[PDB]
Amino acid sequence: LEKNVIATQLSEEAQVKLEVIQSLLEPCDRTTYGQKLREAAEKLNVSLRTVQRLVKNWEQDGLVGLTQTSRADKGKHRIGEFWENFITKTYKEGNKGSKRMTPKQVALRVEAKARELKDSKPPNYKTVLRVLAPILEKQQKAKSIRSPGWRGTTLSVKTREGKDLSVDYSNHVWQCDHTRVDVLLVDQHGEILSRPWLTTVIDTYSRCIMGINLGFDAPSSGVVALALRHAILPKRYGSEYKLHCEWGTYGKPEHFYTDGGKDFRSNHLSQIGAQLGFVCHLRDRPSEGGVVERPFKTLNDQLFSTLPGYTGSNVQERPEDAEKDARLTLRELEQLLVRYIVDRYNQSIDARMGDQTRFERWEAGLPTVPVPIPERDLDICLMKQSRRTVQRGGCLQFQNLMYRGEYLAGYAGETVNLRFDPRDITTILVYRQENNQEVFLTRAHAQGLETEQLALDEAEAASRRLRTAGKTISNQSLLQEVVDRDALKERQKLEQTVLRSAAVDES
Amino acid sequence: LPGYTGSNVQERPEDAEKDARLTLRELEQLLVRYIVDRYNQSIDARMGDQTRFERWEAGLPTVPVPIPERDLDICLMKQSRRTV
Amino acid sequence: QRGGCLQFQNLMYRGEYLAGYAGETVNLRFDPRDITTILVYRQENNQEVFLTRAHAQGLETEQLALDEAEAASRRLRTAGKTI
DNA sequence: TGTACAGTGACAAATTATCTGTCGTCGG
DNA sequence: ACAACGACATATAATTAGTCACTGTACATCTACGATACGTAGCGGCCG
DNA sequence: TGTACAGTGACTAATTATATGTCGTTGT
DNA sequence: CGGCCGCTACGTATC
Ligand SMILES: [Mg+2]
């Protein structure tokens, strides 16, 4: 290869040598050039042989030949190899696994071996630091390494399969994951609840935020189903959100890309994906999915750090007043966060581009305007019970609840596919297999509960209590084990009440 | 020691639960060797002249009289009254 | 250091009006023949500015010279090195 | 090619207290 | 006779190991645990 | 006046690759 | 007396 070297910051001594060399650039004659050397021996206080060496160092190296080169020992240690290997490997072994041995502690191991070997000059602690110095800088550098980024309109998302998804247009690849927000919220009475969970759905091509879910609720394939319908459907917000632009963003993904959480690697999201026709894809590392993750730092920096009750990004940065200074309810935080996403965030510049907004790039990036799906057809969100069988008397029994259906007595002994809503299990949609296809059969209803609404976590909590209470299984008996615990509080029920009040304001 | 958790969660070695090995009896063997042979034998700061133990022992107003172990019955809890 | 204190030759010095400068850097001047009192100067763009006097604390009344304080310090280091 | 917002070096422009001429005034 | 290069000797700051006074930051109850999913096994009721 | 250990500027001693003379040798 | 089929319970994995 090519091998060049250039001098810099030359002057401090070297300008005197440079002026000597400038006076000597030409062998004018054998008589005169010797006189020029013997004259230069007045500017440098040195013999003819020192000036002849200077001229040879200049002619063979150029300007660096004026500068004094560093000694051959620079960076080598005089303590001998035994001690240099003992010190290096002792450090490394002592920082193996969970151990975090300090150089001082390494020096103690040096004095201990020197005592065993009857040495008299075990390296001093100051020299231990020096010997370990280079392998500490490396560690600090290896943490600090920057990565460039996608540049221009071309983007290839890596999966856990080693396949890359080429992101060609708007709604080609959506992405999703969850996080805690960093604000403690209060109930409608001003008492502490908990820090909400935020879900975001993003389109990869435009980086526009295509939908959210905010709530005290837990990450679940239900919260993902709700984030999906909010992303897919056309969006409506009332004047109490004070929006000055529209979240005009909707339609159905071709692919959905996620971390490996049990919300996403689930049969429920598989069934949603098969019915909507989108393919579920797995993120290979957290560092591949920055389009999901980075909305979250921006929101900490642009929104949540400026709100009362802020908790910091971690426990070492927690404002000590966070538990006393909380003020917002979930309905206030959503009314702030939705505004932020519609008026600010989707209207800001797409950073890869510099000359489009995130929304402008999404809208112009559709291959065609997609048709709005009917709100009833989002019943593909309903969970599937795969292999329950019809009992004689036209009956289905399910999470203790017993169901009756309009044609269902025709199919006693047969196997049926049941589609249901975890928010309301009073009613079941019954499908059956015919010609190796599902066909709709009937809207079965929990007998004697046709006037009544049970969510699955209520029927489940009532069943747990009923099992442990030792009472019999029936549709009312389960309702009886709800209505007391309803009427008679526990943080999850208090959270659920505030979350419900937000869902009411959605209607 | 194996199983070190760092000072707080931000330092927690990812292997802390993979690398735990000591029983409570073994940690106490180590901790008492350390306190007797090392910590109480180190030089007292705020002085520099004296070993920490030597400063305790020379510091005494008098040699204390040992208390018979049975006379640490005083450590028993009192139930302030019961009525016969 | 807090309350207007400085460390010099292992002695601790307390400044007369210095307490407002805690956590600041100051420079300082003294006569080697007698380091019981030290003169503290604030640092500025082309100048040192005289700030206040500071006096040694916890020492014997007899006036302390600089060479004598170095000696006290090497006696402590020698004693520590016996352990 | 992970990612995108806030903080930070590097450079340019308008304003003002400060350094320089030139002249006038006063003292030795 | 003049200039350039090497042998040999001699003095020299760069580098490293060591010592010392001043200072920064942890000790100050605290992440194993909660919340989802799947995958497999079990309990009695109903039928042969 | 919290409290005491590990890391850090500031200075010094031992070692060495390196710059300087001085002379011998060779080319011109 | 023996076998088959809904609703609970334990074990494992991941954010
Ligand atoms: Mg995740």
mmCIF file of C-alpha atoms in Angstrom, chain A residues 136-439:
data_model
loop_
_atom_site.group_PDB
_atom_site.id
_atom_site.type_symbol
_atom_site.label_atom_id
_atom_site.label_comp_id
_atom_site.label_asym_id
_atom_site.label_seq_id
_atom_site.Cartn_x
_atom_site.Cartn_y
_atom_site.Cartn_z
ATOM 1 C CA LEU A 136 -9.231 0.167 30.047
ATOM 2 C CA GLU A 137 -9.295 2.705 27.182
ATOM 3 C CA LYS A 138 -10.254 -0.057 24.795
ATOM 4 C CA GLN A 139 -13.235 -0.956 26.975
ATOM 5 C CA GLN A 140 -14.342 2.668 27.101
ATOM 6 C CA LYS A 141 -13.950 3.067 23.292
ATOM 7 C CA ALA A 142 -15.824 -0.196 22.532
ATOM 8 C CA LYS A 143 -18.868 1.144 24.506
ATOM 9 C CA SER A 144 -18.741 4.571 22.738
ATOM 10 C CA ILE A 145 -18.808 3.357 19.066
ATOM 11 C CA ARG A 146 -21.265 5.335 16.848
ATOM 12 C CA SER A 147 -23.209 3.781 13.918
ATOM 13 C CA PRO A 148 -24.164 5.668 10.732
ATOM 14 C CA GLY A 149 -27.734 5.277 9.480
ATOM 15 C CA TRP A 150 -29.967 4.547 6.521
ATOM 16 C CA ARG A 151 -29.336 7.371 4.068
ATOM 17 C CA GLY A 152 -31.831 8.265 1.311
ATOM 18 C CA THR A 153 -34.978 6.377 0.116
ATOM 19 C CA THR A 154 -33.822 2.757 0.555
ATOM 20 C CA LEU A 155 -34.354 0.652 3.725
ATOM 21 C CA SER A 156 -33.895 -3.102 4.449
ATOM 22 C CA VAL A 157 -35.261 -4.352 7.833
ATOM 23 C CA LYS A 158 -33.364 -7.432 9.174
ATOM 24 C CA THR A 159 -35.392 -10.303 10.697
ATOM 25 C CA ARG A 160 -34.425 -13.128 13.113
ATOM 26 C CA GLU A 161 -34.637 -15.377 9.984
ATOM 27 C CA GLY A 162 -31.604 -13.527 8.437
ATOM 28 C CA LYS A 163 -34.003 -12.351 5.653
ATOM 29 C CA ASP A 164 -34.232 -8.582 5.081
ATOM 30 C CA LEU A 165 -37.605 -6.925 4.300
ATOM 31 C CA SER A 166 -37.129 -4.282 1.566
ATOM 32 C CA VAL A 167 -39.417 -1.387 2.700
ATOM 33 C CA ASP A 168 -40.766 0.006 -0.600
ATOM 34 C CA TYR A 169 -43.867 2.155 0.274
ATOM 35 C CA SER A 170 -46.316 3.399 2.970
ATOM 36 C CA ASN A 171 -47.962 0.549 4.944
ATOM 37 C CA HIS A 172 -45.451 -2.017 3.578
ATOM 38 C CA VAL A 173 -43.959 -2.703 7.077
ATOM 39 C CA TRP A 174 -45.528 -1.502 10.310
ATOM 40 C CA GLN A 175 -43.699 -1.968 13.605
ATOM 41 C CA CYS A 176 -44.719 -2.241 17.286
ATOM 42 C CA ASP A 177 -43.421 -2.705 20.914
ATOM 43 C CA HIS A 178 -44.376 -1.264 24.396
ATOM 44 C CA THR A 179 -42.804 0.832 27.128
ATOM 45 C CA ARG A 180 -43.660 2.538 30.414
ATOM 46 C CA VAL A 181 -44.177 6.274 30.349
ATOM 47 C CA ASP A 182 -42.208 8.200 32.975
ATOM 48 C CA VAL A 183 -45.059 10.012 34.743
ATOM 49 C CA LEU A 184 -47.026 8.875 37.811
ATOM 50 C CA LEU A 185 -50.735 9.496 37.213
ATOM 51 C CA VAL A 186 -53.563 9.991 39.714
ATOM 52 C CA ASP A 187 -57.192 8.846 39.852
ATOM 53 C CA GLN A 188 -60.113 11.324 39.492
ATOM 54 C CA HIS A 189 -59.821 11.908 43.310
ATOM 55 C CA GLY A 190 -56.108 12.930 43.100
ATOM 56 C CA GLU A 191 -54.613 9.733 44.694
ATOM 57 C CA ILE A 192 -51.618 7.900 43.082
ATOM 58 C CA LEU A 193 -52.342 5.133 40.558
ATOM 59 C CA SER A 194 -49.304 3.978 38.508
ATOM 60 C CA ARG A 195 -47.201 4.931 35.409
ATOM 61 C CA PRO A 196 -49.182 4.081 32.213
ATOM 62 C CA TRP A 197 -48.005 1.780 29.436
ATOM 63 C CA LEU A 198 -47.693 3.317 25.937
ATOM 64 C CA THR A 199 -47.921 1.250 22.715
ATOM 65 C CA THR A 200 -47.101 2.763 19.313
ATOM 66 C CA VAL A 201 -47.635 1.481 15.784
ATOM 67 C CA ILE A 202 -45.329 3.099 13.213
ATOM 68 C CA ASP A 203 -45.020 2.739 9.432
ATOM 69 C CA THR A 204 -41.377 2.066 8.448
ATOM 70 C CA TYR A 205 -41.431 3.849 5.060
ATOM 71 C CA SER A 206 -42.656 7.232 6.382
ATOM 72 C CA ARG A 207 -41.830 6.946 10.144
ATOM 73 C CA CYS A 208 -45.293 8.484 10.788
ATOM 74 C CA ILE A 209 -47.013 7.303 14.025
ATOM 75 C CA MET A 210 -49.983 5.336 12.628
ATOM 76 C CA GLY A 211 -51.679 4.549 15.977
ATOM 77 C CA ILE A 212 -51.284 4.292 19.787
ATOM 78 C CA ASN A 213 -52.745 2.740 22.916
ATOM 79 C CA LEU A 214 -52.224 4.418 26.338
ATOM 80 C CA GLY A 215 -53.511 2.851 29.590
ATOM 81 C CA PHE A 216 -52.803 1.312 33.014
ATOM 82 C CA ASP A 217 -53.432 -2.089 31.327
ATOM 83 C CA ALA A 218 -50.688 -4.727 30.883
ATOM 84 C CA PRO A 219 -48.973 -5.600 27.659
ATOM 85 C CA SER A 220 -51.194 -8.376 26.261
ATOM 86 C CA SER A 221 -52.276 -9.697 22.817
ATOM 87 C CA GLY A 222 -55.433 -7.665 23.655
ATOM 88 C CA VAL A 223 -53.450 -4.399 23.940
ATOM 89 C CA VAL A 224 -51.830 -5.260 20.572
ATOM 90 C CA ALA A 225 -55.262 -5.987 19.027
ATOM 91 C CA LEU A 226 -56.446 -2.540 20.278
ATOM 92 C CA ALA A 227 -53.312 -0.774 18.957
ATOM 93 C CA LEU A 228 -53.928 -2.501 15.572
ATOM 94 C CA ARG A 229 -57.578 -1.395 15.239
ATOM 95 C CA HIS A 230 -56.652 2.195 16.275
ATOM 96 C CA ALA A 231 -53.891 2.167 13.658
ATOM 97 C CA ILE A 232 -56.008 0.574 10.853
ATOM 98 C CA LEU A 233 -59.305 2.441 11.173
ATOM 99 C CA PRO A 234 -59.926 6.108 10.166
ATOM 100 C CA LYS A 235 -59.413 8.255 13.304
ATOM 101 C CA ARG A 236 -61.860 10.728 15.001
ATOM 102 C CA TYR A 237 -61.094 13.088 17.891
ATOM 103 C CA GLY A 238 -63.399 15.685 19.457
ATOM 104 C CA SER A 239 -62.818 19.358 20.065
ATOM 105 C CA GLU A 240 -61.690 18.690 23.708
ATOM 106 C CA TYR A 241 -58.392 17.481 22.200
ATOM 107 C CA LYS A 242 -58.021 21.005 20.550
ATOM 108 C CA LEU A 243 -56.385 19.538 17.416
ATOM 109 C CA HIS A 244 -55.388 22.025 14.640
ATOM 110 C CA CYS A 245 -54.363 19.360 12.016
ATOM 111 C CA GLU A 246 -55.931 15.888 11.370
ATOM 112 C CA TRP A 247 -54.354 12.488 12.084
ATOM 113 C CA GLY A 248 -55.484 11.563 8.575
ATOM 114 C CA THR A 249 -53.679 8.150 8.768
ATOM 115 C CA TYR A 250 -55.306 4.695 8.287
ATOM 116 C CA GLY A 251 -55.390 1.435 6.247
ATOM 117 C CA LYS A 252 -53.957 -2.079 6.535
ATOM 118 C CA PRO A 253 -50.257 -3.192 6.706
ATOM 119 C CA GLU A 254 -48.778 -5.885 4.461
ATOM 120 C CA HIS A 255 -46.209 -6.858 7.163
ATOM 121 C CA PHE A 256 -45.922 -6.355 10.955
ATOM 122 C CA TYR A 257 -42.464 -6.374 12.616
ATOM 123 C CA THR A 258 -41.994 -6.847 16.387
ATOM 124 C CA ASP A 259 -39.799 -7.884 19.294
ATOM 125 C CA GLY A 260 -40.246 -11.410 20.638
ATOM 126 C CA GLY A 261 -42.704 -10.512 23.480
ATOM 127 C CA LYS A 262 -45.490 -13.027 24.179
ATOM 128 C CA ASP A 263 -48.030 -10.425 22.985
ATOM 129 C CA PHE A 264 -46.651 -10.763 19.429
ATOM 130 C CA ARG A 265 -45.437 -14.386 19.203
ATOM 131 C CA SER A 266 -48.982 -15.549 20.057
ATOM 132 C CA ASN A 267 -51.797 -17.514 18.424
ATOM 133 C CA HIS A 268 -54.102 -14.458 18.826
ATOM 134 C CA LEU A 269 -51.843 -12.185 16.728
ATOM 135 C CA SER A 270 -51.313 -15.076 14.238
ATOM 136 C CA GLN A 271 -55.108 -15.346 13.731
ATOM 137 C CA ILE A 272 -55.458 -11.501 13.380
ATOM 138 C CA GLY A 273 -52.546 -11.571 10.858
ATOM 139 C CA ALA A 274 -54.028 -14.479 8.821
ATOM 140 C CA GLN A 275 -57.507 -12.828 8.644
ATOM 141 C CA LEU A 276 -56.078 -9.315 7.808
ATOM 142 C CA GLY A 277 -53.515 -10.965 5.431
ATOM 143 C CA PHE A 278 -50.391 -9.443 7.044
ATOM 144 C CA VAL A 279 -47.243 -11.429 7.892
ATOM 145 C CA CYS A 280 -45.753 -11.411 11.424
ATOM 146 C CA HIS A 281 -41.941 -10.865 11.467
ATOM 147 C CA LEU A 282 -39.439 -11.057 14.343
ATOM 148 C CA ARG A 283 -36.889 -8.338 15.221
ATOM 149 C CA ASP A 284 -33.349 -9.780 15.386
ATOM 150 C CA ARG A 285 -32.063 -7.340 18.117
ATOM 151 C CA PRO A 286 -33.495 -4.263 19.968
ATOM 152 C CA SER A 287 -31.001 -2.235 17.879
ATOM 153 C CA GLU A 288 -32.748 -3.277 14.561
ATOM 154 C CA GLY A 289 -36.138 -1.733 15.561
ATOM 155 C CA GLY A 290 -35.081 1.866 16.271
ATOM 156 C CA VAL A 291 -38.153 3.145 14.339
ATOM 157 C CA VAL A 292 -40.337 1.808 17.228
ATOM 158 C CA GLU A 293 -37.928 2.481 20.057
ATOM 159 C CA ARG A 294 -36.886 6.051 19.201
ATOM 160 C CA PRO A 295 -40.416 7.587 19.303
ATOM 161 C CA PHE A 296 -40.059 6.725 23.001
ATOM 162 C CA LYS A 297 -36.873 8.814 23.688
ATOM 163 C CA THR A 298 -38.295 11.770 21.706
ATOM 164 C CA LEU A 299 -41.496 11.689 23.822
ATOM 165 C CA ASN A 300 -39.437 11.698 27.106
ATOM 166 C CA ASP A 301 -37.487 14.713 25.764
ATOM 167 C CA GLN A 302 -40.242 16.696 24.036
ATOM 168 C CA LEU A 303 -43.305 15.795 26.181
ATOM 169 C CA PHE A 304 -43.099 13.789 29.429
ATOM 170 C CA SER A 305 -40.033 15.430 31.130
ATOM 171 C CA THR A 306 -41.951 18.754 31.138
ATOM 172 C CA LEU A 307 -45.067 17.285 32.955
ATOM 173 C CA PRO A 308 -45.643 17.142 36.793
ATOM 174 C CA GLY A 309 -45.062 13.694 38.378
ATOM 175 C CA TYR A 310 -42.133 12.876 36.012
ATOM 176 C CA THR A 311 -40.071 9.862 37.247
ATOM 177 C CA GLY A 312 -36.835 9.965 35.175
ATOM 178 C CA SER A 313 -35.516 7.399 32.742
ATOM 179 C CA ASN A 314 -34.196 5.248 35.615
ATOM 180 C CA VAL A 315 -34.107 5.007 39.475
ATOM 181 C CA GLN A 316 -30.831 6.966 39.752
ATOM 182 C CA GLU A 317 -32.371 9.980 38.015
ATOM 183 C CA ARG A 318 -35.821 9.833 39.752
ATOM 184 C CA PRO A 319 -36.952 13.325 40.922
ATOM 185 C CA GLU A 320 -37.520 12.833 44.693
ATOM 186 C CA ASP A 321 -40.823 14.788 44.488
ATOM 187 C CA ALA A 322 -42.386 12.496 41.803
ATOM 188 C CA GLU A 323 -44.735 10.670 44.273
ATOM 189 C CA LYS A 324 -45.922 14.002 45.873
ATOM 190 C CA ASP A 325 -46.050 16.129 42.682
ATOM 191 C CA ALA A 326 -48.356 13.902 40.544
ATOM 192 C CA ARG A 327 -51.457 15.729 39.105
ATOM 193 C CA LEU A 328 -52.631 14.342 35.725
ATOM 194 C CA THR A 329 -55.181 11.534 35.191
ATOM 195 C CA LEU A 330 -55.040 9.129 32.206
ATOM 196 C CA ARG A 331 -57.620 11.302 30.372
ATOM 197 C CA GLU A 332 -55.402 14.405 30.714
ATOM 198 C CA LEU A 333 -52.269 12.509 29.616
ATOM 199 C CA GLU A 334 -54.007 11.125 26.500
ATOM 200 C CA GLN A 335 -55.407 14.615 25.672
ATOM 201 C CA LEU A 336 -51.793 15.939 25.776
ATOM 202 C CA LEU A 337 -50.115 12.933 24.049
ATOM 203 C CA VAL A 338 -52.606 12.725 21.137
ATOM 204 C CA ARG A 339 -52.222 16.484 20.502
ATOM 205 C CA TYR A 340 -48.416 16.097 20.569
ATOM 206 C CA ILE A 341 -48.591 13.269 17.975
ATOM 207 C CA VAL A 342 -51.065 15.033 15.614
ATOM 208 C CA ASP A 343 -49.909 18.699 15.800
ATOM 209 C CA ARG A 344 -46.129 18.261 16.442
ATOM 210 C CA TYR A 345 -44.647 14.845 15.846
ATOM 211 C CA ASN A 346 -46.282 13.654 12.606
ATOM 212 C CA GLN A 347 -45.796 17.256 11.251
ATOM 213 C CA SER A 348 -41.992 17.381 11.931
ATOM 214 C CA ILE A 349 -39.268 16.690 9.298
ATOM 215 C CA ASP A 350 -38.418 13.043 8.429
ATOM 216 C CA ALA A 351 -34.776 13.083 9.568
ATOM 217 C CA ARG A 352 -33.410 10.738 6.814
ATOM 218 C CA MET A 353 -34.821 13.182 4.219
ATOM 219 C CA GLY A 354 -34.672 16.757 5.595
ATOM 220 C CA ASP A 355 -37.323 18.047 3.075
ATOM 221 C CA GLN A 356 -40.606 16.180 3.904
ATOM 222 C CA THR A 357 -42.796 15.912 7.023
ATOM 223 C CA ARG A 358 -43.484 12.398 8.399
ATOM 224 C CA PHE A 359 -47.177 12.689 7.442
ATOM 225 C CA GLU A 360 -46.449 14.248 4.013
ATOM 226 C CA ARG A 361 -44.097 11.330 3.255
ATOM 227 C CA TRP A 362 -46.712 8.777 4.390
ATOM 228 C CA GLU A 363 -49.573 10.262 2.332
ATOM 229 C CA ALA A 364 -47.456 10.708 -0.827
ATOM 230 C CA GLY A 365 -45.893 7.235 -0.217
ATOM 231 C CA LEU A 366 -49.113 5.151 -0.553
ATOM 232 C CA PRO A 367 -49.098 3.073 -3.803
ATOM 233 C CA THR A 368 -52.897 3.842 -3.841
ATOM 234 C CA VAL A 369 -55.602 5.241 -1.504
ATOM 235 C CA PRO A 370 -56.831 2.173 0.496
ATOM 236 C CA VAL A 371 -60.573 1.625 1.090
ATOM 237 C CA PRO A 372 -61.672 2.056 4.759
ATOM 238 C CA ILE A 373 -62.571 -1.381 6.254
ATOM 239 C CA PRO A 374 -66.074 -1.621 7.964
ATOM 240 C CA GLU A 375 -65.881 -1.388 11.758
ATOM 241 C CA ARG A 376 -67.790 -4.743 11.954
ATOM 242 C CA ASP A 377 -65.095 -6.485 9.846
ATOM 243 C CA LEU A 378 -62.559 -5.656 12.581
ATOM 244 C CA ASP A 379 -64.347 -8.604 14.323
ATOM 245 C CA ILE A 380 -61.238 -10.473 13.056
ATOM 246 C CA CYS A 381 -59.892 -9.144 16.409
ATOM 247 C CA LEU A 382 -62.207 -11.608 18.268
ATOM 248 C CA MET A 383 -60.257 -14.437 20.020
ATOM 249 C CA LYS A 384 -60.737 -18.011 18.662
ATOM 250 C CA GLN A 385 -61.638 -21.074 20.714
ATOM 251 C CA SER A 386 -60.494 -23.726 18.305
ATOM 252 C CA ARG A 387 -61.957 -27.190 19.244
ATOM 253 C CA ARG A 388 -64.909 -26.959 21.734
ATOM 254 C CA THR A 389 -67.693 -29.466 20.952
ATOM 255 C CA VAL A 390 -71.479 -29.007 20.948
ATOM 256 C CA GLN A 391 -73.242 -30.929 23.737
ATOM 257 C CA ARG A 392 -76.691 -32.571 23.346
ATOM 258 C CA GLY A 393 -79.475 -30.072 24.076
ATOM 259 C CA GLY A 394 -77.754 -27.502 21.747
ATOM 260 C CA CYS A 395 -75.230 -26.357 24.381
ATOM 261 C CA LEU A 396 -71.647 -25.039 24.652
ATOM 262 C CA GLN A 397 -69.952 -24.673 27.903
ATOM 263 C CA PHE A 398 -66.891 -22.200 28.057
ATOM 264 C CA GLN A 399 -64.976 -20.447 30.986
ATOM 265 C CA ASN A 400 -67.782 -21.963 33.249
ATOM 266 C CA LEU A 401 -70.436 -20.027 31.223
ATOM 267 C CA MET A 402 -73.065 -22.068 29.341
ATOM 268 C CA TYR A 403 -74.327 -20.908 25.932
ATOM 269 C CA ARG A 404 -77.434 -21.569 23.778
ATOM 270 C CA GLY A 405 -77.690 -20.947 19.996
ATOM 271 C CA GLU A 406 -80.449 -20.556 17.390
ATOM 272 C CA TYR A 407 -79.571 -23.598 15.183
ATOM 273 C CA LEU A 408 -77.012 -25.172 17.540
ATOM 274 C CA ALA A 409 -79.138 -28.178 18.634
ATOM 275 C CA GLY A 410 -78.828 -29.426 14.987
ATOM 276 C CA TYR A 411 -75.061 -30.056 15.585
ATOM 277 C CA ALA A 412 -74.786 -31.837 18.955
ATOM 278 C CA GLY A 413 -71.610 -34.015 18.962
ATOM 279 C CA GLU A 414 -69.864 -31.753 16.339
ATOM 280 C CA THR A 415 -66.804 -29.439 16.780
ATOM 281 C CA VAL A 416 -67.114 -25.629 16.384
ATOM 282 C CA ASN A 417 -64.842 -22.607 16.129
ATOM 283 C CA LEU A 418 -65.917 -19.918 18.610
ATOM 284 C CA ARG A 419 -65.143 -16.206 18.086
ATOM 285 C CA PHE A 420 -65.503 -14.004 21.154
ATOM 286 C CA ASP A 421 -64.752 -10.625 22.694
ATOM 287 C CA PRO A 422 -62.720 -10.553 25.958
ATOM 288 C CA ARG A 423 -64.545 -7.247 26.790
ATOM 289 C CA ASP A 424 -67.973 -8.933 26.429
ATOM 290 C CA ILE A 425 -68.270 -12.787 26.604
ATOM 291 C CA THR A 426 -72.103 -12.789 27.080
ATOM 292 C CA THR A 427 -72.363 -13.532 23.304
ATOM 293 C CA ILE A 428 -70.320 -16.012 21.152
ATOM 294 C CA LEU A 429 -70.125 -16.120 17.342
ATOM 295 C CA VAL A 430 -70.193 -19.787 16.261
ATOM 296 C CA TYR A 431 -68.493 -20.929 13.051
ATOM 297 C CA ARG A 432 -68.172 -24.575 11.894
ATOM 298 C CA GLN A 433 -66.003 -26.387 9.305
ATOM 299 C CA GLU A 434 -67.772 -27.356 6.035
ATOM 300 C CA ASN A 435 -66.009 -28.225 2.695
ATOM 301 C CA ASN A 436 -62.803 -27.534 4.668
ATOM 302 C CA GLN A 437 -63.841 -23.856 5.034
ATOM 303 C CA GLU A 438 -65.326 -21.999 8.057
ATOM 304 C CA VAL A 439 -69.025 -21.112 7.521
#
